[PDB]
Amino acid sequence: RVMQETMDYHALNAMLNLYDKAGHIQFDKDQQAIDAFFATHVRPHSVTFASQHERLGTLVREGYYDDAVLARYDRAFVLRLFEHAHASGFRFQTFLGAWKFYTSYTLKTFDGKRYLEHFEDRVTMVALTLAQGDETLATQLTDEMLSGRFQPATPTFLNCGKQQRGELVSCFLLRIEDNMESIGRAVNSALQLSKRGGGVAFLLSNLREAGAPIKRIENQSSGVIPVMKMLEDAFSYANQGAGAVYLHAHHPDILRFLDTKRIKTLSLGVVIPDITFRLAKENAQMALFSPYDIQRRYGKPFGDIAISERYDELIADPHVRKTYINARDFFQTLAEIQFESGYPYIMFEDTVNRANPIAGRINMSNLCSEILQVNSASRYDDNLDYTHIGHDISCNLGSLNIAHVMDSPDIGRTVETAIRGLTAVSDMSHIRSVPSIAAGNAASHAIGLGQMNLHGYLAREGIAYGSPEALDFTNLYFYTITWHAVHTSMRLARERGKTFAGFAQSRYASGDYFTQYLQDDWQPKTAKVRALFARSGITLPTREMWLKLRDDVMRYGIYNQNLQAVPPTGSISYINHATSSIHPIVAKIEIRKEGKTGRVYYPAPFMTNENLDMYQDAYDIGPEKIIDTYAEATRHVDQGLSLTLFFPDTATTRDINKAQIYAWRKGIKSLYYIRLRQL
């Protein structure tokens, strides 16, 4: 109001980092930070036009907005939607969300001096982009985004509608075959993807080990390390461009591989089948097989056969060279490297395939260990031309904010919109630099819908993370989300007359995918959990519904080969105002090293001085509770979930190992990095 003092937003934000003699925080100060930000910074540097109409005009004229996007609608519908947007009542809930959106997400004039968009403008453009002319779908997307229910991945949210636009997808998984063409391509792909800001993970399990033959002459191959060396250099050059490599635990270079991190910027990931755990239990030895022999004798690559199921067969075939290391020592090295670097990530091959409803095996994952899909080899001509374009994996993501989803009765529309939005991201993608990525996305329409703010919700509702109530909720919540997503995908296939490639061989086709849901235990184990769904008007899918969907799926099929995937939510979290994963908060007042002050503080959603006790941080909760929560969700998520375990700095490799053992026994499909308290 008229003449007011104190307008230093950072100072105000910083008050969040103060405790009073009773251990309380002045949460109000953040809000005052917001207000001061808008008054001293946002408003003064934002561009206001005489009307929406003249703005679009100008924005398209000076090369900011892409007229092609706007051209798919009657301009009037366009003006009406922006108006509906700015009428929604949207407010940033935290000083960091606001600042984060203005400093990194919103459109600025090319000289960088002024803003040209506000939150609702960006949402609007995203809705127009994804809706592709479908007015009713564009309004919904708008609504879902403004209400906080849906939040598309950073790369989509940022580029949609812009003239000078990045890619809408930024995370890829490529396989490498055991021949020089496939290697040269991989380095090329790294290069063309990295320059476009993509996260790229590479499978190494098919490469022949150090010492294997080449053209029949003995002891000649160099193994994976030198290829890692090349992929590493490509990622450094093209820059924001990060890499990963996955290697099967029973591959001959496994220890040399792990030893690179004892190569500086590549992330490592290990695939571990069940047999490896059995071996370590009985203090046995691990047999490592040569991909070179496996190819010659079995006619498929290392990364395409099933090690566990053929373990003994392989050890018996004298035509397959075997090498041996100490299983228990393997896990020991693993925990020690993880203790220091956070990775290697771990992908439980047997758990994954056993749960995989798609014909084929899953031999790798991504830079965040949440993506798990099938892939297939590409073959090349000597000039590097593709003679057979296989299928690799690009990964289209977005996430719902659990609290807001529960706060809206029409949960079926909430999910269906998101699925329709991600599906669009897939439909509009054509990654030209790497045909196997373009073929794959086009054949599978695979998408990854995820969740966030679970902790935020459970706290708001007075439930403690990890508790029997919590576990009950996360099981039934993922239960219902799954029902509506599969339904939406079925509708898409029906309204489009096509299904994902190879649907017929899926467990969706035969019906086996539903067995799980046809048995019981979908009755709320807890009384509070029954109360939450009821007070929200959400109906937990009943056996009839599943039985009905089974028939629809079997008859019409589904459009997307994969629907869910739960990554960590990076900085979109601050915008959407959600607690990052489905995992507990890493802190009450998360501190970030950003901006002209050095730090910006972020309070957890729905947290106040009267409910602090519900915000025990991830360290305090510990691994068990976290693993348990993820276990409940893993029973439904058809892909994976980035799972990080937070440990005190006195934890030991045995502690780490015991956690991983528990994760494994519990059904967890994958583990992201193990993190130790250090600030």
Place this chain on the structure above:
Amino acid sequence: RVMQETMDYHALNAMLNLYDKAGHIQFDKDQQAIDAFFATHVRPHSVTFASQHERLGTLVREGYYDDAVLARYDRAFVLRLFEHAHASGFRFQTFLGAWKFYTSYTLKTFDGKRYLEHFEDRVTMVALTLAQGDETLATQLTDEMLSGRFQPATPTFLNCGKQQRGELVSCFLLRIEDNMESIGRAVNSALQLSKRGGGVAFLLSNLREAGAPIKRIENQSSGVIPVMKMLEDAFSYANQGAGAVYLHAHHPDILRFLDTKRIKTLSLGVVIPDITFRLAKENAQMALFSPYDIQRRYGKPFGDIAISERYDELIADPHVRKTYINARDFFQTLAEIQFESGYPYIMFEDTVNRANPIAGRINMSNLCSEILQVNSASRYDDNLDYTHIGHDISCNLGSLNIAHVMDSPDIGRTVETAIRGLTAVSDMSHIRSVPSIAAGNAASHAIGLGQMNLHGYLAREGIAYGSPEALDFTNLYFYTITWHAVHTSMRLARERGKTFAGFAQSRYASGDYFTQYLQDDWQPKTAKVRALFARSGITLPTREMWLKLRDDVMRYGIYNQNLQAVPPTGSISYINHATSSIHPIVAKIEIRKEGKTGRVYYPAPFMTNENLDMYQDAYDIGPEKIIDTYAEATRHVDQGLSLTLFFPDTATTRDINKAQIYAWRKGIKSLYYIRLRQL
């Protein structure tokens, strides 16, 4: 003979490293080394068949000889040629030649225990391979090789005719364009070429400098170093696979570039135009121009415009960003790096283009600085597919042994055979992994005929290296070789009805190429030199001949775009028994660190205790005499000559620089490495 002692060939070889109280060597001991080698080793482990016929049979049956080669002739002609071969009277002249041929060049049984070929068998197979069914040409090749007059490059000599065969060409030059596709391809090429043992050189002058824009955003590019880093790693992986990079002296990263060697295994090469020398003379500054601007404003890449001719224009255009360093300090850094590492190589751009008879500019050279040809850009699709296949350079080599050439009157047949042989190497090449190399070789038919044993000859004839007699001879000898090579190429074009691509724009077409030869100074300046040609029956081409060839060339054209190129002769030298280049011997008894004894000693050809004074080593002769000799040859060789300068270990960078200045003023097209005495 019946019961003889002393059969240790190495011990006998080693006697060459002994001086008697009068400073004389027992050269006879080497011969005894040969004899003992044959008796104790070669004969006992060689496979003898009941007949030639059964041998071919077996060799083709067990997968050693390629029946496709033999199939181009009546088997009888085949048996007759092997017989003519073994009847020639061929003898190894030195213990190293023999051992070198048996341990590294001849065909062995796959288990490595026995030899399956002798010198004449390998020569025969090479003649059959290159002759391609032409019986008369196969006999000649056989004769030329057995007499010592011709010696094909190692890669050809070694693989021809073999079933399990390497490439016949192993040296390539590729250009890189200023875009990510072209970079990815380059790394790919490195990989596919290196695995096949090729030497690959890359042009970097077109890449935009560190700090240049990308997509209009300022300060973004990383320059050449990170690309060097990638090419370096590719060469380490694919292994025997060596690399080089060339950079224009006036490129903005010139000092960062040089600074990598102050990157461990890549060779460096610098292109230096005349202006740079003028600047250093007047202690001026060097202007470095940005390839990014040059492209935008001139529409061609840095490496395609003429810096010297546009120096001032460029400095004046305010649309071209300029950077500045101290010319004299540049040469200083150069000499200091050369002092320690031998390179950078140096290619005198202006000298080269001025002498280039082919339409286009020459912007790079090879790993040995003897190759100088034109090239052109390739353009790519985003999937890396070629949309326009440009022209890169592969390099087909072989060399004549001057002494033996002079020892045969029909010098016209000697040259014509060699040209026909190299041309075949070109005709049979199809490097599939890199289309620009295949296109180029197919469009130009470029070959590189070279010379060796010059010092061996001059010594035999009692002429001192560097002397006025010597200079007279090397000028007229290269004069005549040139006449017959151009003649042969003209005949080829005539008998094949086609010329090199772009002949019409060449100086061969207009006739300007001959002007040089139409004026005088082809009269032997020395009386001995007149005597040598006469005593050999070789007629120095007369103006009539040139005048006649001019008409023939202008009317029928020539087949090959380039004919001569004088590289250093590696180990083929020991086989052919020639003094390596056209440069003086590096030693009287060259010592090599090879074999079970650690060393093998090699005496120079035609050297005895009564003519030692004619074998002053390269150090003793010094740079001037060497440069001078090369100057005489450079006036005729249409490509280049690897020129190494040998210095005492007390030489200074000023000494090095003064040499390079003299080379430059003298016409030298290029300089290989500067070597300092160190053993």
